[PDB]
Write an enzyme that holds these catalytic residues in place. Structure first.
Site, PDB file in Angstrom:
ATOM      1  N   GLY B  11       1.024  -1.118   0.106  1.00 39.02           N
ATOM      2  CA  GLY B  11       0.108  -0.317  -0.050  1.00 39.02           C
ATOM      3  C   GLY B  11       0.838   1.474   0.281  1.00 39.02           C
ATOM      4  N   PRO B  12       0.356   2.747   0.049  1.00 43.43           N
ATOM      5  CA  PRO B  12       1.399   4.466  -0.389  1.00 43.43           C
ATOM      6  C   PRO B  12       1.763   3.435   1.303  1.00 43.43           C
ATOM      7  CG  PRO B  12      -1.166   4.629  -1.063  1.00 43.43           C
ATOM      8  CD  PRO B  12      -1.260   2.779  -0.233  1.00 43.43           C
ATOM      9  N   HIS B  13       3.114   4.555   1.435  1.00 44.29           N
ATOM     10  CA  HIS B  13       4.400   4.764   1.766  1.00 44.29           C
ATOM     11  C   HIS B  13       3.750   5.345   3.606  1.00 44.29           C
ATOM     12  CE1 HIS B  13       5.787   8.305   0.044  1.00 44.29           C
ATOM     13  NE2 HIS B  13       5.052   7.669  -0.608  1.00 44.29           N
ATOM     14  N   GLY B  14       4.289   4.769   4.110  1.00 43.82           N
ATOM     15  CA  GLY B  14       3.551   6.405   5.474  1.00 43.82           C
ATOM     16  C   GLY B  14       2.305   5.718   6.140  1.00 43.82           C
ATOM     17  N   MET B  15       1.853   4.928   6.033  1.00 43.88           N
ATOM     18  CA  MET B  15       0.862   4.259   6.629  1.00 43.88           C
ATOM     19  C   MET B  15       0.727   3.284   7.914  1.00 43.88           C
ATOM     20  SD  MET B  15      -2.009   3.144   3.758  1.00 43.88           S
ATOM     21  CE  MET B  15      -1.141   1.714   3.411  1.00 43.88           C
ATOM     22  N   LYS B  17       2.602   0.870   8.037  1.00 40.93           N
ATOM     23  CA  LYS B  17       2.732  -1.034   7.264  1.00 40.93           C
ATOM     24  C   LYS B  17       3.779  -1.821   8.390  1.00 40.93           C
ATOM     25  CE  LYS B  17       3.073  -0.269   3.461  1.00 40.93           C
ATOM     26  NZ  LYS B  17       4.312  -0.755   2.957  1.00 40.93           N
ATOM     27  N   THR B  18       5.066  -1.103   7.853  1.00 41.38           N
ATOM     28  CA  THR B  18       6.435  -2.060   7.989  1.00 41.38           C
ATOM     29  C   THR B  18       6.555  -2.123  10.252  1.00 41.38           C
ATOM     30  OG1 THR B  18       7.679  -0.006   9.415  1.00 41.38           O
ATOM     31  CG2 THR B  18       7.707  -0.973   7.017  1.00 41.38           C
ATOM     32  N   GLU B  34      11.234  -4.499   4.236  1.00 39.88           N
ATOM     33  CA  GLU B  34      11.602  -3.748   3.213  1.00 39.88           C
ATOM     34  C   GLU B  34      13.724  -4.027   3.255  1.00 39.88           C
ATOM     35  OE1 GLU B  34      12.351   0.632   4.247  1.00 39.88           O
ATOM     36  OE2 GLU B  34      10.670   0.383   3.330  1.00 39.88           O
ATOM     37  N   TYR B  52      13.474  10.667  -5.423  1.00 40.16           N
ATOM     38  CA  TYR B  52      12.806  12.348  -4.478  1.00 40.16           C
ATOM     39  C   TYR B  52      13.618  13.281  -5.262  1.00 40.16           C
ATOM     40  CZ  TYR B  52       9.396  10.063  -1.595  1.00 40.16           C
ATOM     41  OH  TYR B  52       8.106   8.673  -1.730  1.00 40.16           O
ATOM     42  N   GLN B  76      13.461   2.318 -10.976  1.00 39.44           N
ATOM     43  CA  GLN B  76      12.515   1.558 -10.832  1.00 39.44           C
ATOM     44  C   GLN B  76      13.001   0.125 -10.492  1.00 39.44           C
ATOM     45  OE1 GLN B  76      10.335   1.992  -8.767  1.00 39.44           O
ATOM     46  NE2 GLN B  76      10.148   4.747  -9.223  1.00 39.44           N
ATOM     47  N   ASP B 107       7.216  -7.480   3.699  1.00 34.94           N
ATOM     48  CA  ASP B 107       6.905  -6.001   3.442  1.00 34.94           C
ATOM     49  C   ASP B 107       7.143  -5.858   1.616  1.00 34.94           C
ATOM     50  OD1 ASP B 107       7.551  -3.422   3.118  1.00 34.94           O
ATOM     51  OD2 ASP B 107       8.676  -3.566   6.040  1.00 34.94           O
ATOM     52  N   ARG B 108       5.813  -5.947   2.017  1.00 36.83           N
ATOM     53  CA  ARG B 108       5.212  -5.027   0.045  1.00 36.83           C
ATOM     54  C   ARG B 108       5.189  -6.571  -0.434  1.00 36.83           C
ATOM     55  NH1 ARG B 108       6.811   0.876   0.518  1.00 36.83           N
ATOM     56  NH2 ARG B 108       4.503   1.447   0.255  1.00 36.83           N
ATOM     57  N   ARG B 165       6.984  10.976   9.466  1.00 35.89           N
ATOM     58  CA  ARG B 165       7.940   9.563   9.210  1.00 35.89           C
ATOM     59  C   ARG B 165       8.705   9.281   7.349  1.00 35.89           C
ATOM     60  N   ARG B 167      11.606   8.758   4.736  1.00 31.37           N
ATOM     61  CA  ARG B 167      12.840   8.338   4.335  1.00 31.37           C
ATOM     62  C   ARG B 167      14.008   8.635   4.467  1.00 31.37           C
ATOM     63  NH1 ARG B 167      10.170   3.409   6.180  1.00 31.37           N
ATOM     64  NH2 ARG B 167       8.600   4.064   4.394  1.00 31.37           N
ATOM     65  N   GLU B 170      14.015  10.394   1.305  1.00 31.76           N
ATOM     66  CA  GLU B 170      12.443  10.857   0.944  1.00 31.76           C
ATOM     67  C   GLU B 170      12.203  12.787   1.312  1.00 31.76           C
ATOM     68  OE1 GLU B 170       9.128   8.616   2.281  1.00 31.76           O
ATOM     69  OE2 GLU B 170       8.543   9.450   3.121  1.00 31.76           O
TER      70      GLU B 170
HETATM   71  N1  LIG Z   1       9.564   1.636  -5.800  1.00 36.33           N
HETATM   72  C1  LIG Z   1       9.223   2.060  -5.277  1.00 36.33           C
HETATM   73  N2  LIG Z   1       9.114   2.450  -4.040  1.00 36.33           N
HETATM   74  C2  LIG Z   1       9.169   3.906  -3.745  1.00 36.33           C
HETATM   75  C3  LIG Z   1       9.261   4.802  -4.450  1.00 36.33           C
HETATM   76  N3  LIG Z   1       8.768   6.485  -4.365  1.00 36.33           N
HETATM   77  C4  LIG Z   1       8.841   6.179  -3.362  1.00 36.33           C
HETATM   78  N4  LIG Z   1       8.897   4.376  -2.770  1.00 36.33           N
HETATM   79  C5  LIG Z   1       8.672   3.946  -0.933  1.00 36.33           C
HETATM   80  O1  LIG Z   1       9.020   5.155  -0.105  1.00 36.33           O
HETATM   81  C6  LIG Z   1      10.285   4.806  -0.532  1.00 36.33           C
HETATM   82  C7  LIG Z   1       9.988   3.978   1.267  1.00 36.33           C
HETATM   83  O2  LIG Z   1       9.867   3.008   0.782  1.00 36.33           O
HETATM   84  C8  LIG Z   1       9.504   4.564  -6.014  1.00 36.33           C
HETATM   85  O3  LIG Z   1       9.693   4.458  -7.175  1.00 36.33           O
HETATM   86  N5  LIG Z   1       9.819   3.074  -5.924  1.00 36.33           N
END
Ligand SMILES: Nc1nc2c(ncn2COCCO)c(=O)[nH]1
Ligand SMILES: Nc1nc2c(ncn2COCCO)c(=O)[nH]1
Lengths: 300, 304
Positions: B11-15, B17-18, B34, B52, B76, B107-108, B165, B167, B170
């Site tokens: 799911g989206p980061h920053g929720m 999950k970890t 992760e 970023y 990617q 984790d993902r 939170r 990274r 980030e």
């Molecule tokens: N795979 C992937 N994770 C990302 C990207 N942007 C943010 N994240 C996830 O946030 C980074 C920490 O997991 C991206 O382009 N690719």
């Protein structure tokens, strides 16, 4: 269910592959030139050769070139990836075939061989290379790969006569790709004869010596821990390479002859290739139209 | 034979999950974390930071769309590498569908890197749809028992959770947060759309619970002019890529976890979703311990 015989014509470019395949219930899945030049992106082959020349000349850094070069391989292999993915469910178990599918290259050319060659050219990181390796689709039954043989000088001449749009005659690249393909064939024999890369890894410090297989390219400093140990991630990608290659059936075609002979020779090499059953009764027509549609849309 | 239960928290980061997955394991259950060390060191240098800064340069107009895409695409590839090898290595051990003799909390899932993040960067303008579909074409076959947990969290709550939170490398990009929340929402709908009998080919012209509208699925992002032939239809190469997408997501078992609660709440909520998740048999007698070592080695080497 009927039978299919798939044949992937692969090897270094400039040997007369396309040329001799055209010379041959037999569909030809051609070189996706339109995807490379326009569909996936704008003139990818040109992009690939200009970047290397810019690297060769020092106009840009190895890191700039690597990012461009890596992004490009994705565009180059796309057509082979969807083809394999869409075809996979139709392929059955090993078994005159009802259909012969001749392909212009296999997925490993774009997911292993060329990235490997670009690494050896200093424009691809070895970690990028093993990331493509980890993505190689599972090896289906009846994967017959025909690789070519041609003395280097006749190859230079042939390479020269027929080049692609945007391409540059790179002798260093020709040497890099020849080594990779040469190593590839040795790896398949190594693996088939019982070779365990983990057991022979020390040797890098009746089968081919690991030093003559593709595993030698990965005893690369970027992949190693401070104590000289290969990181497990990277070692795991090597276990996949080994799995994917061992089940392939390799055949060698001497291109050092006239176009009629090469063409003859390929037909000759068909007798020991492995055929498979298809999955449904409607597989052949479905396979045929895929071949012709691909041809129609991506062959230039 | 012994059974296995695999669960991928995505799911989206920053929720959170970890955090909650670790809490779950603190209660024969291994966590595959992760792989931050691969992203910061082993695969490349500070990949999250590269991503970023790049979207940032693009946003500011310091680089061009072509420049950003080339960088985003290679980045990617580094991001998803650890997911892909783990999947390839673990694959011959998973048997047919079937308490579990082992529970693996990942984790993902590989699709996070091979579909969701690329799809979002496309929406952000730093990736091409042709590149996204190439990644999709490379999504590994879906193994039986693929239970995937996606999360839910209000945007205001989500936004505030991010302004901390973060990274390393980030940056607070709310536009990317919207894109990624949107992409995972589409992922969820796409799975039910397909499980409810949807056929993207049948509904192309239209561009638990009832079957969603294709316009609320991932298919809707690939109505891009780059993908379209002069006659208005999609080029066949791109259509075949969507055939793969539908084949991959249709056999996944999706569950939604509410992250709008305390960490212990999330953990217990996740523990409840788990009792009714699909298990599988392993193929060999020694797959279990082997699988244990793999997750432990992965964790030891790539966690950070
Ligand atoms: N795979 C992937 N994770 C990302 C990207 N942007 C943010 N994240 C996830 O946030 C980074 C920490 O997991 C991206 O382009 N690719
Ligand atoms: N896939 C791939 N093919 C290449 C590359 N460089 C040259 N070729 C050859 O393919 C077409 C003829 O040049 C490369 O980097 N990748």
């Amino acid at each position: 269910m009927p039978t299919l015989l798939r044949v992937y014509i692969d090897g270094p470019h400039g040997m007369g592959k396309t040329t001799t395949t055209q010379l041959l219930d037999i569909v030809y899945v051609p070189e996706p030139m339109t995807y490379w030049r326009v569909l996936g992106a704008s003139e990818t082959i040109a992009n690939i050769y200009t970047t290397q020349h810019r690297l060769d000349q020092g106009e840009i850094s190895a890191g700039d070139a690597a990012v461009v070069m890596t992004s490009a391989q994705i565009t180059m292999g796309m057509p082979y990836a969807v083809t394999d993915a869409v075809l996979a469910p139709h392929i059955g178990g090993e078994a005159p075939p009802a259909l012969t599918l001749i392909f212009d290259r296999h997925p490993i050319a774009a997911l292993l061989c060329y990235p490997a060659a670009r690494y050896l050219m200093g424009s691809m990181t070895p970690q990028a290379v093993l990331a493509f390796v980890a993505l190689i689709p599972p090896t289906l039954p009846g994967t017959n790969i025909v690789l070519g043989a041609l003395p280097e000088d006749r190859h230079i001449d042939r390479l020269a006569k027929r080049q692609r749009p945007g391409e540059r005659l790179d002798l260093a690249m020709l040497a890099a790709i020849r080594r990779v393909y040469g190593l590839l064939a040795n790896t398949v024999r190594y693996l088939q004869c019982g070779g365990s890369w983990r057991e022979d890894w020390g040797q890098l410090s009746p089968r081919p010596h690991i030093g003559d297989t593709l595993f030698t390219l990965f005893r690369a400093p970027e992949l190693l821990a401070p104590n000289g140990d290969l990181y497990n991630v990277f070692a795991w990608a090597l276990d996949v390479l080994a799995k994917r290659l061992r089940s392939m059936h390799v055949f060698i075609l001497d291109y050092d002859q006239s176009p009629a002979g090469c063409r003859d020779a390929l037909l000759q090499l068909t007798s020991g290739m492995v055929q498979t059953h298809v999955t449904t009764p409607g597989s052949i027509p479905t396979i045929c139209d895929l071949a012709r549609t691909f041809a129609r849309e991506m062959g230039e």
